[PDB]
Amino acid sequence: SKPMEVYVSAVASPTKFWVQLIGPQSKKLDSMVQEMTSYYSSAENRAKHVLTAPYVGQIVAAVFKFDEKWYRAEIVDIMPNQYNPKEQVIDLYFVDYGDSEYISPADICELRTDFLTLRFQAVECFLANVKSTIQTEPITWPKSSIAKFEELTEVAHWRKLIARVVTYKETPLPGVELFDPADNSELNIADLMITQGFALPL
Protein backbone atom coordinates (compact mmCIF):
# COMPACT_ATOMS: atom_id res chain seq x y z
CA SER A 1 0.00 0.00 0.00
CA LYS A 2 1.32 3.41 -1.02
CA PRO A 3 1.98 5.72 1.97
CA MET A 4 -0.01 8.96 1.70
CA GLU A 5 0.79 12.13 3.63
CA VAL A 6 -2.37 13.49 5.30
CA TYR A 7 -3.73 15.75 7.98
CA VAL A 8 -6.59 14.62 10.20
CA SER A 9 -8.67 17.78 9.93
CA ALA A 10 -11.73 16.79 11.99
CA VAL A 11 -12.90 13.96 14.27
CA ALA A 12 -16.24 12.51 15.33
CA SER A 13 -14.78 9.17 16.44
CA PRO A 14 -12.04 6.70 15.49
CA THR A 15 -14.50 5.25 13.00
CA LYS A 16 -15.61 8.61 11.67
CA PHE A 17 -13.03 11.31 10.93
CA TRP A 18 -11.75 13.36 8.02
CA VAL A 19 -8.38 13.70 6.36
CA GLN A 20 -6.88 16.19 3.95
CA LEU A 21 -4.28 15.16 1.38
CA ILE A 22 -0.98 16.98 1.74
CA GLY A 23 0.49 18.33 -1.49
CA PRO A 24 -0.62 20.68 -4.26
CA GLN A 25 -4.18 20.27 -2.91
CA SER A 26 -3.42 21.56 0.59
CA LYS A 27 -1.71 24.66 -0.82
CA LYS A 28 -4.65 25.34 -3.13
CA LEU A 29 -7.05 24.98 -0.16
CA ASP A 30 -5.07 27.51 1.83
CA SER A 31 -5.23 29.95 -1.10
CA MET A 32 -8.96 29.47 -1.54
CA VAL A 33 -9.68 30.09 2.15
CA GLN A 34 -7.73 33.35 1.95
CA GLU A 35 -9.44 34.50 -1.24
CA MET A 36 -12.93 33.65 0.05
CA THR A 37 -12.10 35.38 3.36
CA SER A 38 -10.95 38.59 1.61
CA TYR A 39 -13.86 38.54 -0.77
CA TYR A 40 -16.68 37.96 1.72
CA SER A 41 -15.18 40.29 4.35
CA SER A 42 -16.68 43.04 2.17
CA ALA A 43 -20.28 44.04 2.89
CA GLU A 44 -20.64 45.14 -0.76
CA ASN A 45 -19.46 41.75 -2.00
CA ARG A 46 -21.79 39.94 0.44
CA ALA A 47 -24.61 42.06 -0.95
CA LYS A 48 -24.13 40.32 -4.33
CA HIS A 49 -24.70 36.90 -2.77
CA VAL A 50 -27.60 37.26 -0.36
CA LEU A 51 -28.71 33.87 0.93
CA THR A 52 -32.28 33.54 -0.32
CA ALA A 53 -34.39 30.37 -0.41
CA PRO A 54 -31.81 28.11 1.26
CA TYR A 55 -32.23 24.34 0.82
CA VAL A 56 -30.73 21.17 2.29
CA GLY A 57 -27.82 20.23 0.02
CA GLN A 58 -26.93 23.76 -1.06
CA ILE A 59 -23.25 24.63 -1.17
CA VAL A 60 -22.74 28.03 0.44
CA ALA A 61 -20.10 30.38 1.82
CA ALA A 62 -20.04 30.76 5.62
CA VAL A 63 -17.90 32.61 8.10
CA PHE A 64 -16.83 30.86 11.30
CA LYS A 65 -16.92 33.94 13.55
CA PHE A 66 -14.48 32.55 16.08
CA ASP A 67 -11.62 32.37 13.53
CA GLU A 68 -13.10 35.03 11.21
CA LYS A 69 -12.49 32.95 8.09
CA TRP A 70 -14.93 32.11 5.30
CA TYR A 71 -15.45 28.47 4.27
CA ARG A 72 -17.24 26.31 1.70
CA ALA A 73 -20.10 24.54 3.46
CA GLU A 74 -23.02 22.22 2.71
CA ILE A 75 -26.43 22.79 4.31
CA VAL A 76 -27.33 19.53 6.01
CA ASP A 77 -30.25 20.80 8.11
CA ILE A 78 -32.36 23.92 8.55
CA MET A 79 -33.47 24.10 12.18
CA PRO A 80 -35.54 26.33 14.44
CA ASN A 81 -33.70 28.86 16.61
CA GLN A 82 -35.05 28.16 20.07
CA TYR A 83 -34.26 31.66 21.31
CA ASN A 84 -35.12 33.54 18.12
CA PRO A 85 -38.14 32.70 15.91
CA LYS A 86 -36.87 35.23 13.33
CA GLU A 87 -33.89 33.19 12.12
CA GLN A 88 -33.28 29.55 11.59
CA VAL A 89 -30.13 27.88 12.81
CA ILE A 90 -28.29 26.30 9.89
CA ASP A 91 -26.46 22.99 10.27
CA LEU A 92 -23.44 23.29 7.97
CA TYR A 93 -20.98 20.61 6.91
CA PHE A 94 -17.61 22.25 6.23
CA VAL A 95 -16.67 20.43 3.05
CA ASP A 96 -12.94 21.12 3.13
CA TYR A 97 -12.32 20.25 6.81
CA GLY A 98 -15.06 17.84 7.91
CA ASP A 99 -16.48 19.51 11.03
CA SER A 100 -20.14 20.47 11.12
CA GLU A 101 -21.29 23.67 12.81
CA TYR A 102 -24.56 25.30 13.75
CA ILE A 103 -24.41 28.68 12.10
CA SER A 104 -26.70 31.70 11.86
CA PRO A 105 -28.04 32.58 8.36
CA ALA A 106 -26.59 36.02 9.09
CA ASP A 107 -23.13 34.47 8.62
CA ILE A 108 -23.92 32.78 5.30
CA CYS A 109 -23.77 33.86 1.64
CA GLU A 110 -24.32 32.20 -1.73
CA LEU A 111 -21.06 30.80 -3.07
CA ARG A 112 -19.41 32.59 -6.01
CA THR A 113 -19.39 29.97 -8.75
CA ASP A 114 -15.63 29.83 -9.38
CA PHE A 115 -15.03 28.88 -5.74
CA LEU A 116 -16.55 25.50 -6.67
CA THR A 117 -13.52 24.61 -8.81
CA LEU A 118 -11.33 22.97 -6.16
CA ARG A 119 -12.28 19.43 -5.17
CA PHE A 120 -13.86 19.25 -1.70
CA GLN A 121 -10.87 18.59 0.48
CA ALA A 122 -12.09 16.61 3.51
CA VAL A 123 -12.19 12.84 2.96
CA GLU A 124 -14.28 10.85 5.41
CA CYS A 125 -12.51 7.73 6.77
CA PHE A 126 -12.71 5.13 9.48
CA LEU A 127 -9.74 3.68 11.35
CA ALA A 128 -9.40 0.14 10.01
CA ASN A 129 -9.17 -2.98 12.19
CA VAL A 130 -10.51 -1.51 15.42
CA LYS A 131 -13.80 -1.55 17.27
CA SER A 132 -15.16 -0.05 20.47
CA THR A 133 -14.11 -1.44 23.85
CA ILE A 134 -17.71 -1.54 24.91
CA GLN A 135 -19.56 -4.69 23.69
CA THR A 136 -22.86 -4.11 25.47
CA GLU A 137 -24.74 -2.04 22.66
CA PRO A 138 -25.91 0.22 20.59
CA ILE A 139 -22.37 1.29 20.84
CA THR A 140 -20.30 4.13 20.10
CA TRP A 141 -16.88 4.98 21.36
CA PRO A 142 -16.21 5.85 25.00
CA LYS A 143 -15.42 9.56 25.26
CA SER A 144 -11.96 8.58 26.49
CA SER A 145 -11.39 6.56 23.28
CA ILE A 146 -12.37 9.59 21.21
CA ALA A 147 -10.02 11.84 23.20
CA LYS A 148 -7.15 9.35 22.81
CA PHE A 149 -7.70 9.34 19.06
CA GLU A 150 -7.86 13.14 18.89
CA GLU A 151 -4.58 13.25 20.83
CA LEU A 152 -2.85 10.64 18.66
CA THR A 153 -3.86 12.42 15.45
CA GLU A 154 -3.42 15.91 16.97
CA VAL A 155 -6.54 16.76 14.98
CA ALA A 156 -6.67 20.24 13.42
CA HIS A 157 -3.11 21.12 14.46
CA TRP A 158 -1.48 20.27 11.12
CA ARG A 159 0.30 17.11 12.25
CA LYS A 160 1.47 15.13 9.22
CA LEU A 161 0.48 11.47 9.30
CA ILE A 162 1.19 8.62 6.91
CA ALA A 163 -1.98 6.95 5.66
CA ARG A 164 -2.58 3.69 3.81
CA VAL A 165 -6.03 2.57 2.63
CA VAL A 166 -6.61 -1.07 3.61
CA THR A 167 -10.36 -1.80 3.49
CA TYR A 168 -13.83 -0.38 2.88
CA LYS A 169 -17.36 -0.42 4.24
CA GLU A 170 -20.78 0.76 3.08
CA THR A 171 -19.79 4.88 -2.72
CA PRO A 172 -17.44 3.04 -0.31
CA LEU A 173 -16.04 4.59 2.88
CA PRO A 174 -12.27 4.06 3.07
CA GLY A 175 -10.81 2.31 6.10
CA VAL A 176 -7.29 3.49 6.71
CA GLU A 177 -4.21 2.78 8.69
CA LEU A 178 -2.46 5.80 10.25
CA PHE A 179 1.17 6.16 11.29
CA ASP A 180 2.86 9.12 12.97
CA PRO A 181 6.32 9.53 11.42
CA ALA A 182 7.39 12.07 14.06
CA ASP A 183 6.71 10.01 17.12
CA ASN A 184 9.25 7.51 18.37
CA SER A 185 7.12 4.44 17.85
CA GLU A 186 6.92 1.83 15.12
CA LEU A 187 3.30 1.11 16.08
CA ASN A 188 0.51 2.59 14.00
CA ILE A 189 -2.38 4.45 15.61
CA ALA A 190 -4.77 1.48 15.67
CA ASP A 191 -2.10 -0.60 17.44
CA LEU A 192 -1.38 2.13 19.97
CA MET A 193 -5.09 2.34 20.77
CA ILE A 194 -5.47 -1.45 21.15
CA THR A 195 -2.33 -2.03 23.21
CA GLN A 196 -3.33 0.82 25.56
CA GLY A 197 -6.91 -0.43 25.93
CA PHE A 198 -8.76 2.35 24.09
CA ALA A 199 -9.87 -0.05 21.35
CA LEU A 200 -10.30 -3.75 20.58
CA PRO A 201 -9.12 -5.65 17.49
CA LEU A 202 -11.50 -7.05 14.81
Side-chain angles (χ1 to χ4, degrees), residues 1-170 172-202:
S1 302
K2 178 177 199 189
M4 301 175 287
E5 297 188 335
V6 303
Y7 303 122
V8 173
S9 50
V11 172
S13 91
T15 50
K16 183 166 187 164
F17 60 98
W18 291 262
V19 305
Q20 303 167 328
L21 272 306
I22 293 170
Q25 296 78 15
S26 57
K27 190 188 174 131
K28 290 177 190 194
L29 173 51
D30 174 82
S31 298
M32 183 188 69
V33 175
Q34 169 176 339
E35 187 182 351
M36 286 180 57
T37 295
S38 300
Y39 181 73
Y40 287 103
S41 285
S42 168
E44 151 153 47
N45 285 332
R46 291 197 303 273
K48 302 170 180 169
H49 304 288
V50 167
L51 183 70
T52 78
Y55 56 87
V56 171
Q58 184 175 351
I59 305 301
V60 299
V63 55
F64 194 64
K65 286 263 203 193
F66 278 103
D67 73 3
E68 309 280 5
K69 293 182 188 170
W70 283 81
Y71 299 90
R72 300 191 300 179
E74 170 184 2
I75 300 180
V76 296
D77 205 355
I78 299 174
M79 312 166 90
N81 180 304
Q82 211 139 31
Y83 299 85
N84 182 15
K86 273 66 166 176
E87 77 156 53
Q88 312 107 318
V89 170
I90 312 299
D91 186 354
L92 288 178
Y93 166 72
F94 285 63
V95 300
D96 295 311
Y97 292 85
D99 282 299
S100 294
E101 310 287 343
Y102 301 108
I103 297 290
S104 168
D107 286 347
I108 299 170
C109 293
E110 299 191 337
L111 187 63
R112 209 181 71 199
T113 304
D114 51 309
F115 287 137
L116 279 175
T117 301
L118 184 60
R119 184 182 298 278
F120 291 174
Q121 288 296 305
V123 178
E124 186 184 346
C125 306
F126 64 98
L127 195 62
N129 307 133
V130 300
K131 74 183 181 181
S132 184
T133 53
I134 311 312
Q135 294 184 62
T136 271
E137 290 192 58
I139 283 232
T140 54
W141 289 85
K143 293 234 180 62
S144 63
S145 288
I146 304 183
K148 182 60 184 190
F149 183 72
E150 295 187 39
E151 196 190 329
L152 287 176
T153 56
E154 209 188 0
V155 53
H157 290 276
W158 311 100
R159 167 180 300 263
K160 179 169 58 186
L161 299 177
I162 301 298
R164 296 178 161 81
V165 65
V166 303
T167 187
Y168 306 87
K169 74 162 79 171
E170 289 176 70
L173 258 163
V176 298
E177 156 189 326
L178 296 182
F179 177 82
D180 182 353
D183 73 10
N184 291 314
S185 179
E186 272 176 28
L187 272 62
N188 65 37
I189 286 185
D191 292 327
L192 289 165
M193 287 194 71
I194 290 164
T195 57
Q196 297 172 37
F198 293 97
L200 301 168
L202 295 205

